[PDB]
Design a protein around this ligand. Structure first.
Ligand SMILES: Nc1nc2cc3[nH]c(NCCN4CCOCC4)nc3cc2c(=O)[nH]1
Ligand SMILES: Nc1nc2cc3[nH]c(NCCN4CCOCC4)nc3cc2c(=O)[nH]1
Ligand SMILES: [Zn+2]
Ligand SMILES: [Zn+2]
Lengths: 368, 368
């Protein structure tokens, strides 16, 4: 396989389906990428993550640099070896998490760890270096995420800094031959909810040139209507022939609408982030609800996951109420498997030119 | 398979190896039974428990009657169906846990739940009924566990009550035809550390007649030397042709010494009860220790478990330090697998008439 090759096999409106080929594997798109915060997808062995249908998982520069440490992971052979996942890994650049979980400048950001108050630094150069030490396959440019709401002036300043940092990210990545030859680099579009700023950002990123393009700065409190409105004009600004990655915690309905608007890749803590919510084709349920205490049906009536083949709502209800680890294991496996089945139905429907109908049928039932 | 058949295939001194055949499966002895408190062996799917080599698991009348409820489990099809373990299950009678986690009389005990302060009752009859509702394969007689230390008078009174309750347990079990025909009933020897009381207890239990005999009232603070001393005289008092079950939280060394003294069955929360302790042939280690932070070796150098085939000490160290659920999953699987490999080595060595040598070699290395 090549370092990076994105091929579009079929289209319907703005929606696309295809594949990203990389050295460690093929990624089917549109793709859902389970999140593996501290070098683990919570409550799942990598083999289980793979069995649900995942082609790629996400790690994070911020969390891993704090614990167990980027240099330590490199000494131990890299993230893939460390956690036992041998397929592609995308790593976020740490920008969002630093400002979510501090001294900022044009050079980068210095901050105190939320774990032990130790002092750390991140810059475009250090972020790219950390992602190298982890051995990431898809490296994200280091950006400044703009808070919502943002004034046009502040959104502009932040976007402009992010574009300067995008060029610095590009150059740092390219100067490291092992990384440049084996990994891919994605740029991140900023500009808040403003069409002109989004256009300037897209133009800057395309001029620099990246392997893929993320839409950043959304899923930060603006709500679905606004997010979809911004996607309507923002995604077409990005190079058509490269993958488009929406950063943020998308519900099933977010994913369907985003695919309708040209997004190819998604992450989400939501299905992982044990709190009792299980996804079904008839909408989410909270398994803690007393109504499930004697319900012998599986979490979802159609789901082909191992959890729905073997255990009842009643059992999972009991486990979650009792705070048992197996409850988190079963809920997480089902939810990630559900998301993957959603992606498969999306891919198949686009391939067959019936995605618009699928989206309508999905929404009618999910929100009935 | 029959309701119950214990066959001894080989012997060495007081040690025995053989099989218990029951309707739901064969149990190889000496046996280690993983503990499944709230209808789950903590952090493991039943398939994983089976893969480690377990033939039977333990449940508890006390915990299950409180949550999710015995009648509820029966309505849902029984414990096996509920949790997805189709092999034999032994259930403790609830006696110990009530007094560990209250109004006592000759009729039984009434108590408040430690979960919600709701009031409950246990008696020989109710305990046997609950074990029936769960669908237990090996049912334990309801007893009164004697605190350590105990005066000879108090040990005698408690032992005598336990023997009266043993007869009541026997009669309750026999009067329920479905239970009598499909399950087995074990009696529990009491008498604290006193040889005469242990003899009286053994005689009473043998006169009533049971499918197996537990040595109760040990592992309650007396220490290994004293426990072994009491086992020295107590086990030979029990019928030779039935299984002998030591109740309590045995370390690997406890198990080896107890087998040397004629015990056939063991339970233990120890390998399950995530706190960082991993068993190895060179003794236990605590994976949280900083010395393991960059150790690429598996938990144990010889262990054939899936954890030791795939992940390093360094990774498991990180997971446990970070409080990640996968850490508990991996530690638990390894520890239960280690215990099963210990049991296999014990069974093989007795079969080959070299158990005494195995015990010596094991101790020399484990305590080096
Ligand atoms: N580098 C970078 N990373 C991003 C990550 C984002 N995540 C979100 N929204 C989801 C936030 N989740 C909610 C659930 O808890 C974890 C955080 N929105 C995000 C936006 C960005 C971004 O603009 N840049
Ligand atoms: N019915 C019955 N059950 C028993 C269970 C026993 N368990 C122990 N010792 C181990 C105690 N563990 C220590 C770890 O935490 C859980 C309790 N000692 C035990 C003794 C008995 C007993 O005499 N009767
Ligand atoms: Zn499912
Ligand atoms: Zn192991």
């Amino acid at each position: 396989r090549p370092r990076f090759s994105f091929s579009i096999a079929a289209r319907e409106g703005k929606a696309r389906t295809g594949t990203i080929e990389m050295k460690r594997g093929v990624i089917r798109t549109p793709a859902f990428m389970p999140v593996g915060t501290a070098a683990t997808v919570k409550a799942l062995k990598p083999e289980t993550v793979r069995a649900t249908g995942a082609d790629i998982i996400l790690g994070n520069t911020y969390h891993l640099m704090l614990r167990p440490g980027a240099e330590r992971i490199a000494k131990l052979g890299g993230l893939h070896s460390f956690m036992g996942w041998d397929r592609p890994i995308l790593t976020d650049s740490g920008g969002y998490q630093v400002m979510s979980l501090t001294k900022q400048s044009e050079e980068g950001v210095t901050f105190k760890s939320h774990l032990d108050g130790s002092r750390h630094m991140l810059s475009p150069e250090r972020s790219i270096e950390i992602q190298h030490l982890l051995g990431s396959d898809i490296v994200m440019a280091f950006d400044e995420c703009t808070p919502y709401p943002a004034t046009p002036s502040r959104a502009a300043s932040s976007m402009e800094r992010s574009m300067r940092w995008a060029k610095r990210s590009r150059d740092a990545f390219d100067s490291r031959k092992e990384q440049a030859e084996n990994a891919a680099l994605f740029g991140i579009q900023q500009g808040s909810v403003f069409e002109n700023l989004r256009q300037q950002s897209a133009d800057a990123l395309a001029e620099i040139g990246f392997d893929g393009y993320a839409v950043g700065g959304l899923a930060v409190g603006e709500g679905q209507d606004e997010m979809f409105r911004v996607l309507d004009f923002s995604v077409p600004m990005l190079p058509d022939d490269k993958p488009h990655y929406l950063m943020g915690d998308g519900k099933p309905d977010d994913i369907v609408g985003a695919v309708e608007r040209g997004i190819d890749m998604f992450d989400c803590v939501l299905p992982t982030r044990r709190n009792g919510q299980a996804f079904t084709w008839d909408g989410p349920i909270n398994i803690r609800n007393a109504r499930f205490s004697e319900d012998l049906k599986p979490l979802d009536s159609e789901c082909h996951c191992a959890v729905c083949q073997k255990w009842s709502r009643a059992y999972i209800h009991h486990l979650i109420r009792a705070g048992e680890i197996l409850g988190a294991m079963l809920m997480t496996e089902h939810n990630i498997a559900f998301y993957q089945q959603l992606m498969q139905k999306i891919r198949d429907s686009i391939s067959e030119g019936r995605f618009s109908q699928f989206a309508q049928d999905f929404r009618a039932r999910y929100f009935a």
